[PDB]
């Protein structure tokens, strides 16, 4: 369209001006530099990133306008025009033919992605039938053109690896080896330092654990990782903690020792201890009171 053409021309001339505007009279002004420059020129302050200012090419700005399907004589181009879903039905026809000639010879795409690739509105059951057809083709022993067909319809997975991040062991102070870890639970911050040897010695906030933690539940909470990993009387921890209460502080301290003993234990045992549930922050925090209520979720009296 002439709209798209003059918009592309305007975008080219504008990005040329914009590079000259900031600092970049050289021809190569890349998109992230364009975004940074417009971010500085117009400081957004809007929570919606689509409500922030934008400088893209009109291909990305404007949507995909579908071309005219017929010429100046009627006579539409595709033979499956009068179905109204020419791309989807042509695809179904092609896959069915490839199954037919394969038989005579012998993660998956989402609906929105298929709609983007076909530039046609699609139904859930139509997409499901397409997926079943491609699954039939995959289960049938197929050749390389079929395989690359399945692979241009298939997309990536972007798998995540979930081994606990092992902090480095810093060989420091005088001659001793340690790890310094952090923990947070219920507005309490606890950063701890464990030295490898010392037969078990705790230094919460400069005093010992029987002094900072008179409660046997808190002392048990401190014990928990060492007793799980069977290295009870072997290490020593010096920790400083801010905020919270007795159990929140105990939990944050415990998370810190677990996330430093991870560095001081083998990888199979730290996967085991992560499965035991010591390397994950407890996201359970205090909720908010609401207007018209009597607490976080507690309400007032008679409503029914």
């Amino acid at each position: 369209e002439d709209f798209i053409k003059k918009q592309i021309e305007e975008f080219n001339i504008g990005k040329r001006h914009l590079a000259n505007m900031m600092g970049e009279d050289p021809e190569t002004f890349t998109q992230e530099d364009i975004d940074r420059a417009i971010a500085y020129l117009f400081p957004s302050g809007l929570f919606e990133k689509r409500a922030r200012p934008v400088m893209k090419h009109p291909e990305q700005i404007f949507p995909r306008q579908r071309a005219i399907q017929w010429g100046e004589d009627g006579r539409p181009f595709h033979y499956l025009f009068y179905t109204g879903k020419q791309s989807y039905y042509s695809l179904m026809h092609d896959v069915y033919g490839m199954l037919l000639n394969l038989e005579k010879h012998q993660r998956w795409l989402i609906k929105e992605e298929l709609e983007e690739m076909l530039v046609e509105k699609l139904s859930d059951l139509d997409y499901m039938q397409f997926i079943r057809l491609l699954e039939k083709l995959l289960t049938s022993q197929c050749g390389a053109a079929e395989e690359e067909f399945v692979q241009r319809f298939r997309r990536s997975v972007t798998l995540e690896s979930k081994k606990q991040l092992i902090e480095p062991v810093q060989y420091d102070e005088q001659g001793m080896a340690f790890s310094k870890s952090e923990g947070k639970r219920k507005t309490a911050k606890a950063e701890a330092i464990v030295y490898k040897h010392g037969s078990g010695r705790i230094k919460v906030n400069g005093i010992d654990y029987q002094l900072y933690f008179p409660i046997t539940q808190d002392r048990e909470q401190l014990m928990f990782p060492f007793h799980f990993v069977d290295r009870l009387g072997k290490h020593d921890v010096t920790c400083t903690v801010s905020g919270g209460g007795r159990s929140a502080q105990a939990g944050a301290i415990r998370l810190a020792m677990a996330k430093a003993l991870c560095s001081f234990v083998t990888e199979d045992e730290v996967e085991w201890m992560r499965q035991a549930g010591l390397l994950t922050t407890d996201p359970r925090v205090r909720e908010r009171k609401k207007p018209g209520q009597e607490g976080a979720r507690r309400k007032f009296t008679w409503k029914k």
Partner: protein
């Protein structure tokens, strides 16, 4: 109307010449098709020529890096340099002992009357005053509520007089008369 200067202008032109002042957008002046706003479902961000939100934006167009560079080529006259007072805090403390706090609070409107902006407070070091032994004992006994133990800093506040310069005068006056009364030996010191 007229065909605008947005397409009349070309490349290699001076934006400090185009926008001297902090001004609202003026998209006809701007050679950039800026699109603003949450788009409709099958549409684009709305256009450049009439955007109330682009006029609402604080518009840092008049300050581009070459404008900072050339402008401070102009401003490089209005500055001297420092002596060799060194980055060392103890060195600059030795060279210049006292430290006085006197700030301003800039509003934006019709009047420039922020009364709290006259607050003044002086911090001085006894280890840089160097001349107080039973005078420093008498000094602490005079000003008990200040002079925390960890650092040897004396902090005297003034918010009693309306003008900032006489607040500074109150600070230096209290420093010198506390010093003189600390060195003034009294007759009842021995019966402690």
């Amino acid at each position: 109307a007229l065909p605008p200067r947005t397409e009349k202008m070309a490349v290699d032109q001076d934006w400090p010449s185009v926008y001297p002042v902090a001004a609202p957008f003026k998209p006809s002046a701007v050679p950039l098709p800026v699109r603003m706003g949450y788009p409709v479902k099958k549409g684009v961000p709305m256009a450049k020529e009439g955007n109330l939100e682009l006029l609402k934006i604080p518009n840092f167009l008049h300050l581009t890096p070459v404008a900072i560079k050339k402008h401070c080529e102009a401003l490089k006259d209005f500055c001297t340099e420092w002596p060799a007072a060194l980055d060392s805090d103890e060195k600059c403390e030795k060279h210049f002992p006292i430290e006085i706090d006197s700030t301003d609070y800039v509003s934006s409107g019709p009047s420039v009357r922020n009364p709290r902006a006259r607050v003044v407070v002086l911090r001085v070091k006894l280890s840089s005053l160097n001349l107080d032994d039973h005078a420093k004992k008498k000094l602490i006994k005079l000003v008990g509520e200040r002079y925390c133990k960890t650092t040897d800093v004396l902090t005297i506040k003034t918010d009693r007089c309306p003008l900032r310069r006489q607040n500074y005068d109150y600070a230096v006056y209290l420093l010198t008369v506390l010093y003189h009364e600390s060195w003034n030996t009294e007759e009842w010191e021995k019966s402690k």
